[PDB]
Short mmCIF file of C-alpha atoms and ligand atoms in Angstrom, two decimals:
data_model
loop_
_atom_site.label_atom_id
_atom_site.label_comp_id
_atom_site.label_asym_id
_atom_site.label_seq_id
_atom_site.Cartn_x
_atom_site.Cartn_y
_atom_site.Cartn_z
CA UNK P 1 -16.54 -12.76 -2.50
CA UNK P 2 -17.21 -9.31 -0.85
CA UNK P 3 -18.62 -5.12 -0.95
CA UNK P 4 -16.12 -1.91 -1.28
CA UNK P 5 -15.97 -1.43 1.96
CA UNK P 6 -14.04 -1.58 4.93
CA UNK P 7 -14.00 -4.17 8.70
CA UNK P 8 -13.31 -6.94 10.85
CA UNK P 9 -12.70 -10.85 8.85
CA UNK P 10 -10.92 -13.38 11.24
CA UNK P 11 -9.39 -11.27 13.85
CA UNK P 12 -7.69 -8.52 10.45
CA UNK P 13 -8.85 -5.19 9.69
CA UNK P 14 -9.42 -5.24 5.77
CA UNK P 15 -10.28 -1.69 2.99
CA UNK P 16 -11.02 -2.87 -0.25
CA UNK P 17 -11.64 -0.12 -2.60
CA UNK P 18 -12.85 0.22 -5.99
CA UNK P 19 -13.78 3.17 -8.60
CA UNK P 20 -16.61 1.25 -10.08
CA UNK P 21 -15.13 0.38 -13.44
CA UNK P 22 -15.57 -3.65 -13.04
CA UNK P 23 -13.12 -6.54 -13.56
CA UNK P 24 -11.64 -7.17 -9.84
CA UNK P 25 -12.60 -9.38 -6.90
CA UNK P 26 -11.95 -9.77 -3.53
CA UNK P 27 -12.51 -12.07 -1.04
CA UNK P 28 -11.30 -12.52 2.94
CA UNK P 29 -10.04 -15.58 3.81
CA UNK P 30 -9.00 -17.79 7.44
CA UNK P 31 -6.95 -15.87 9.57
CA UNK P 32 -4.96 -12.96 7.60
CA UNK P 33 -5.80 -14.67 4.17
CA UNK P 34 -7.14 -12.26 1.26
CA UNK P 35 -6.90 -12.99 -2.60
CA UNK P 36 -7.57 -10.62 -5.31
CA UNK P 37 -8.16 -12.14 -8.84
CA UNK P 38 -8.38 -8.76 -11.95
CA UNK P 39 -9.11 -9.01 -15.24
CA UNK P 40 -8.48 -5.68 -17.45
CA UNK P 41 -9.68 -3.67 -13.69
CA UNK P 42 -10.14 0.04 -13.59
CA UNK P 43 -8.23 1.54 -10.27
CA UNK P 44 -8.26 -0.57 -6.98
CA UNK P 45 -6.69 -0.97 -3.42
CA UNK P 46 -7.31 -4.22 -1.22
CA UNK P 47 -6.02 -5.97 1.46
CA UNK P 48 -5.59 -6.46 5.56
CA UNK P 49 -4.18 -5.11 8.24
CA UNK P 50 -4.12 -2.99 11.46
CA UNK P 51 -7.09 -0.23 12.20
CA UNK P 52 -5.08 2.29 13.60
CA UNK P 53 -1.64 0.82 12.47
CA UNK P 54 1.56 1.84 14.56
CA UNK P 55 4.83 3.37 14.20
CA UNK P 56 6.91 0.43 14.98
CA UNK P 57 4.54 -2.83 13.67
CA UNK P 58 6.78 -5.71 11.96
CA UNK P 59 4.46 -6.69 9.07
CA UNK P 60 4.62 -10.18 7.75
CA UNK P 61 3.47 -11.66 4.39
CA UNK P 62 3.56 -14.66 2.53
CA UNK P 63 2.18 -15.92 -0.96
CA UNK P 64 1.65 -15.67 -4.42
CA UNK P 65 1.71 -12.24 -6.27
CA UNK P 66 0.93 -12.72 -10.25
CA UNK P 67 0.43 -9.45 -12.16
CA UNK P 68 -0.39 -8.40 -15.54
CA UNK P 69 -0.01 -4.82 -16.36
CA UNK P 70 -0.01 -2.06 -13.83
CA UNK P 71 0.17 -3.34 -9.87
CA UNK P 72 1.83 -2.85 -6.64
CA UNK P 73 2.16 -5.06 -3.83
CA UNK P 74 2.82 -3.24 -0.33
CA UNK P 75 3.07 -2.44 3.18
CA UNK P 76 -0.50 0.35 2.48
CA UNK P 77 -1.67 2.64 5.07
CA UNK P 78 -2.42 6.37 6.03
CA UNK P 79 -2.25 9.32 8.32
CA UNK P 80 -4.55 11.96 9.47
CA UNK P 81 -3.35 15.31 10.25
CA UNK P 82 -1.22 15.71 8.17
CA UNK P 83 -3.49 13.55 5.35
CA UNK P 84 -0.13 11.10 3.99
CA UNK P 85 -1.00 8.38 1.66
CA UNK P 86 2.34 5.95 2.29
CA UNK P 87 3.77 2.47 0.64
CA UNK P 88 6.66 0.42 1.29
CA UNK P 89 6.88 -1.68 -1.80
CA UNK P 90 7.95 -4.66 -1.47
CA UNK P 91 6.89 -5.88 -5.49
CA UNK P 92 5.59 -4.07 -8.55
CA UNK P 93 4.15 -5.19 -12.39
CA UNK P 94 5.02 -3.18 -15.06
CA UNK P 95 5.51 -0.08 -13.47
CA UNK P 96 7.91 0.98 -10.47
CA UNK P 97 5.66 3.89 -8.73
CA UNK P 98 8.66 6.19 -8.37
CA UNK P 99 9.39 7.04 -11.83
CA UNK P 100 9.81 10.14 -12.54
CA UNK P 101 9.56 11.35 -8.86
CA UNK P 102 12.76 12.25 -7.13
CA UNK P 103 14.70 10.74 -4.78
CA UNK P 104 14.72 11.41 -1.33
CA UNK P 105 17.85 8.46 0.01
CA UNK P 106 17.82 5.29 0.95
CA UNK P 107 17.29 2.85 3.76
CA UNK P 108 18.04 -0.56 4.00
CA UNK P 109 16.16 -3.16 5.52
CA UNK P 110 15.05 -6.36 5.28
CA UNK P 111 17.21 -7.50 3.35
CA UNK P 112 17.26 -5.23 0.74
CA UNK P 113 18.09 -1.38 -0.15
CA UNK P 114 14.88 0.73 -0.91
CA UNK P 115 14.84 3.21 -2.53
CA UNK P 116 12.65 7.20 -0.58
CA UNK P 117 10.48 9.36 -2.45
CA UNK P 118 7.58 11.99 -2.08
CA UNK P 119 4.78 12.36 -4.96
CA UNK P 120 1.62 15.06 -4.35
CA UNK P 121 -2.10 13.91 -5.53
CA UNK P 122 -3.90 16.45 -6.53
CA UNK P 123 -7.95 16.90 -5.74
CA UNK P 124 -8.00 12.49 -5.68
CA UNK P 125 -10.25 10.37 -3.42
CA UNK P 126 -8.78 10.04 0.21
CA UNK P 127 -10.04 8.32 3.68
CA UNK P 128 -11.26 12.33 4.10
CA UNK P 129 -12.82 12.67 1.20
CA UNK P 130 -11.35 14.46 -1.94
CA UNK P 131 -8.31 16.50 -0.87
CA UNK P 132 -4.97 16.73 -2.10
CA UNK P 133 -2.32 15.43 -0.44
CA UNK P 134 1.74 13.57 -0.17
CA UNK P 135 2.05 9.88 -0.48
CA UNK P 136 5.63 8.78 1.30
CA UNK P 137 7.49 5.83 -0.57
CA UNK P 138 9.74 3.35 -0.05
CA UNK P 139 10.40 0.82 -3.27
CA UNK P 140 12.35 -2.34 -3.01
CA UNK P 141 15.16 -3.21 -4.74
CA UNK P 142 14.57 -6.77 -4.31
CA UNK P 143 11.66 -7.30 -5.51
CA UNK P 144 9.48 -10.58 -3.33
CA UNK P 145 6.51 -11.44 -2.41
CA UNK P 146 7.08 -12.87 1.27
CA UNK P 147 8.81 -10.95 4.22
CA UNK P 148 9.35 -9.02 6.97
CA UNK P 149 9.00 -5.20 7.03
CA UNK P 150 10.61 -3.64 10.24
CA UNK P 151 7.86 0.18 9.66
CA UNK P 152 9.86 1.88 11.86
CA UNK P 153 13.16 1.73 9.81
CA UNK P 154 11.11 3.03 7.37
CA UNK P 155 9.11 5.71 9.40
CA UNK P 156 12.44 6.82 10.65
CA UNK P 157 13.99 7.14 7.30
CA UNK P 158 11.06 9.34 6.05
CA UNK P 159 10.90 11.18 9.33
CA UNK P 160 14.70 12.02 8.49
CA UNK P 161 14.49 13.31 5.32
CA UNK P 162 11.16 15.84 6.02
CA UNK P 163 8.28 13.13 5.68
CA UNK P 164 6.67 13.25 8.28
CA UNK P 165 3.77 10.87 9.37
CA UNK P 166 0.35 12.05 11.91
CA UNK P 167 -1.67 10.26 13.64
CA UNK P 168 -2.24 6.56 11.69
CA UNK P 169 -5.33 5.98 9.90
CA UNK P 170 -5.89 1.87 9.05
CA UNK P 171 -1.99 -0.24 7.71
CA UNK P 172 -2.17 -3.28 5.42
CA UNK P 173 -0.75 -5.26 3.12
CA UNK P 174 -2.49 -4.51 -0.04
CA UNK P 175 -2.73 -5.33 -3.60
CA UNK P 176 -2.93 -2.39 -5.81
CA UNK P 177 -4.27 -2.22 -9.68
CA UNK P 178 -4.84 0.64 -12.46
CA UNK P 179 -6.07 -1.27 -15.30
CA UNK P 180 -4.34 -4.07 -15.25
CA UNK P 181 -4.93 -7.86 -14.65
CA UNK P 182 -4.20 -10.25 -12.80
CA UNK P 183 -4.29 -13.08 -9.22
CA UNK P 184 -2.98 -12.81 -5.84
CA UNK P 185 -2.87 -14.65 -2.62
CA UNK P 186 -1.23 -13.28 0.87
CA UNK P 187 -1.48 -14.21 4.24
CA UNK P 188 -0.80 -11.46 7.17
CA UNK P 189 0.00 -11.24 10.12
O1 LIG Y 201 -16.67 5.67 1.63
C1 LIG Y 201 -15.18 6.31 1.65
C2 LIG Y 201 -13.62 5.17 1.17
O2 LIG Y 201 -14.42 5.54 -0.29
C3 LIG Y 201 -13.27 6.22 0.67
O3 LIG Y 201 -11.70 5.07 0.63
C4 LIG Y 201 -10.47 5.83 -0.26
C5 LIG Y 201 -10.90 6.26 -1.00
O4 LIG Y 201 -9.07 6.36 -1.74
C6 LIG Y 201 -8.87 5.69 -1.43
O5 LIG Y 201 -7.67 5.66 -2.00
C7 LIG Y 201 -7.21 6.02 -3.42
C8 LIG Y 201 -6.28 4.92 -3.63
O6 LIG Y 201 -5.90 4.49 -4.56
C9 LIG Y 201 -4.17 5.97 -4.60
O7 LIG Y 201 -3.21 4.65 -4.84
C10 LIG Y 201 -4.93 6.58 -4.56
O8 LIG Y 201 -3.53 7.71 -4.91
C11 LIG Y 201 -5.96 7.79 -3.78
O9 LIG Y 201 -6.85 8.59 -3.74
C12 LIG Y 201 -8.35 4.71 -0.48
O10 LIG Y 201 -7.28 3.09 -0.68
C13 LIG Y 201 -9.71 4.10 0.08
O11 LIG Y 201 -9.36 3.27 1.52
O12 LIG Y 201 -12.66 6.21 2.81
C14 LIG Y 201 -12.99 7.51 3.02
C15 LIG Y 201 -14.87 6.72 2.50
O13 LIG Y 201 -15.90 7.08 3.44
#
């Protein structure tokens, strides 16, 4: 089990962040593998991938994802200049993160239609400190916990709709939770 922070493990970048609440354990395993076990957590996000990401990576993921409450399983990352937190959401628990958000299009990729949304975070943590910034979402209609994500299809559809990305920072397959419980074991490549 590891400290919240970032680094490399078995050739993969990882990021593990939480709000200090307790109730979440994050572990790095062999190769591109990581696990998360959580029970009455606060907020957290963790997983493995790349630093920096790219705008045409094909990301493969495999494993098991068993949320009990509010959680997402996503390709997750940031850009800088502009600061953007983005998600290609492959599965989630009790809450669809696009609830209440305005739909800005659709994209078909990797066996499913996805719906596209923009939201905004106001004075929230980020890779550069507390900030107000937009979030971009592609939400998969057909939920799954293994597959392949052609990120270019998403980034190109976002750009088409006016959701432009700056310079890529990290890019991971992440489990996120918000005051929930669950378990997950995911392998990235
Ligand atoms: O020490 C600093 C780190 O703590 C910081 O980490 C980032 C903090 O913001 C995190 O993003 C939140 C995660 O939850 C969302 O979905 C929210 O909308 C965000 O506010 C991000 O995951 C962490 O990487 O990075 C900079 C360090 O100085």
